[PDB]
Ligand SMILES: Nc1ncnc2c1ncn2[C@@H]1O[C@H](COP(=O)(O)OP(=O)(O)NP(=O)(O)O)[C@@H](O)[C@H]1O
Ligand SMILES: Nc1ncnc2c1ncn2[C@@H]1O[C@H](COP(=O)(O)OP(=O)(O)NP(=O)(O)O)[C@@H](O)[C@H]1O
Ligand SMILES: CC(C)(COP(=O)(O)O)[C@@H](O)C(=O)NCCCC(=O)O
Ligand SMILES: CC(C)(COP(=O)(O)O)[C@@H](O)C(=O)NCCCC(=O)O
Ligand SMILES: [Mg+2]
């Protein structure tokens with residue numbers, strides 16, 4: 001009903017079924033399942049679009065969280081912005097592997113052999129192994145989106161898939177979702193002309209689907225949202241107001257500039273600081289391992305009670 | 306002067322020098338040099354930005370053109386949107402190589418060995434080889450941008466670097482450049498609130514720097530622009546008007562929906578259709594090889610006359 005005015009992504013019915021099969025198989029083994037949403041959505045201004053209003057998100061938080069959930073034993077349904085950061089691969093950009101990998105001869109017997117200095121691709125072998133172990137166990141399903149429209153439909157299909165697991169399902173909503181849009185009927189047909197003067201656009205508020213998600217689509221699930229602010233004077237109050245309005249369990253609050261090194265875990269009655277050490281930034285650890293460790297422990301208590 | 310109101314990207318002075326050294330070394334060997342710009346720019350709406358107005362461009366046209374220019378003997382200065390399509394690598398996304406590559410043992414003597422089914426990564430060895438040959442010859446310099454501000458400053462620094470080569474330099478301007486912006490003084494300081502009603506924004510026209518580029522920064526260079534339209538009734542007229550206004554040599558015209566299979570090469574007095582065959586889409590060829598073949602031949606005639 002609120003999602004009906006947005007066009008469906010290609011293959012939406014096929015995706016919904018694939019997601020339903022994934023979750024039902026993992027629930028049958030007794031495993032917990034998390035929907036990790038990651039990256040930003042965009043919205044068009046024209047019917048044949050050449051420009052988009054895009055919410056900022058590299059996808060690092062989501063990708064790194066998916067890795068940490070996989071290592072903790074969860075099944076992961078990874079709903080992500082196409083081309084944003086991908087689990088295990090995101091530490092090895094194109095120029096790194098293009099210059100490090102070298103063929104060790106021509107391909108013989110249908111097999112290509114490659115070599116690299118280990119110190120040029122640190123952790124590369126462990127990345128390939130982790131990804132391949134998850135694919136083989138069937139614990140990692142990837143679903144791409146691009147537009148706000150694609151995201152809203154796929155999020156509704158994922159919630160339908162996870163609703164049968166009751167409290168064993170977790171939603172980890174890290175995606176940066178467009179707050180404004182132009183409805184299909186008010187868009188010009190063709191490219192906007194820059195010689196036609198300043199661009200004056202009014203964009204309507206996107207309906208906040210966290211209400212129906214929590215109340216109707218997945219009412220028994222353990223639901224975690226993120227709250228992004230730029231102003232440190234107001235972030236706590238804004239995170240608490242989110243819980244009051246939407247009635248879900250936890251908010252992970254963060255400030256744009258410090259987001260890689262600090263989050264605040266906010267509930268209705270408490271706040272917990274998670275700050276990365278001097279002795280932890282050296283020994284390799286990422287903030288997402290500490291988030292996931294706090295959340296899995298909370299999820300255990302939620303399932304048991 | 307028109308670029309002064311935009312902030313400089315980090316290391317702008319270091320980049321300008323690196324670019325100047327690249328071009329001077331290639332000109333000393335007698336080689337032609339092309340600036341390929343690729344990907345889209347974005348502009349912020351807030352001083353601490355969480356959202357951006359982004360012009361659409363995958364970077365495929367630019368990446369594929371850089372490959373074809375390298376194979377034709379040019380030196381290539383590749384000014385590109387960070388994370389958009391990268392030469393040689395763009396045919397092998399993360400999930401393709403994550404599942405295909407496997408370690409053949411632990412790393413011994415500091416060397417990591419890997420293998421893959423050749424049919425899972427077709428062309429992979431030839432990609433590594435081409436990239437490594439260009440790095441070794443010093444014919445390929447990569448320069449990243451993200452914002453409109455970063456792009457405008459780096460484009461001016463590249464033009465300064467290529468100006469000493471006179472007619473042996475080519476500009477191939479495929480980047481999708483923001484047409485509107487919000488000046489530093491009219492931006493709100495903090496994240497815009499979605500509960501505050503519809504978003505109403507007026508954005509000023511970005512000044513068209515193709516005029517000073519052609520008239521002042523690189524007046525002897527062979528300059529090729531792109532013209533993107535969505536409406537096939539008007540594209541030819543718009544491409545001709547661009548040449549009349551900016552006074553450069555060639556426009557590569559294209560329609561959004563058919564851009565992978567068709568361009569029109571437009572000059573002041575002629576148009577040339579470049580359409581990819583049935584017998585060419587099978588035998589592998591891309592439209593950018595046919596573009597580059599038409600352009601290099603034109604560049605020869607421009608240098609000689
Ligand atoms: N502000 C700018 N400075 C430098 N180059 C630009 C700028 N804007 C566009 N370009 C380049 O100019 C060429 C034309 O882009 P295009 O968007 O088709 O036309 P336009 O001149 O921007 N007018 P419009 O159709 O209103 O967008 C392309 O090669 C772009 O890379
Ligand atoms: N329209 C939506 N539908 C579903 N989830 C959303 C939507 N908008 C935001 N979210 C999620 O809601 C949480 C809050 O996002 P955030 O941008 O901090 O607050 P907001 O509710 O959008 N209000 P504001 O601060 O004005 O943007 C995040 O987990 C987002 O993924
Ligand atoms: C800041 C963000 C996007 C993580 O950043 P990144 O994807 O790791 O660059 C994250 O932690 C978060 O706060 N997500 C909710 C964003 C809210 C919105 O604008 O919809
Ligand atoms: C359409 C485009 C961006 C190539 O697309 P893609 O980067 O290959 O997805 C190209 O051929 C082109 O026409 N570039 C000029 C775009 C003009 C603008 O919006 O600034
Ligand atoms: Mg928001």
Ligand SMILES: [Mg+2]
Pocket residue numbers: 194482483484
């Ligand atoms: Mg334009």
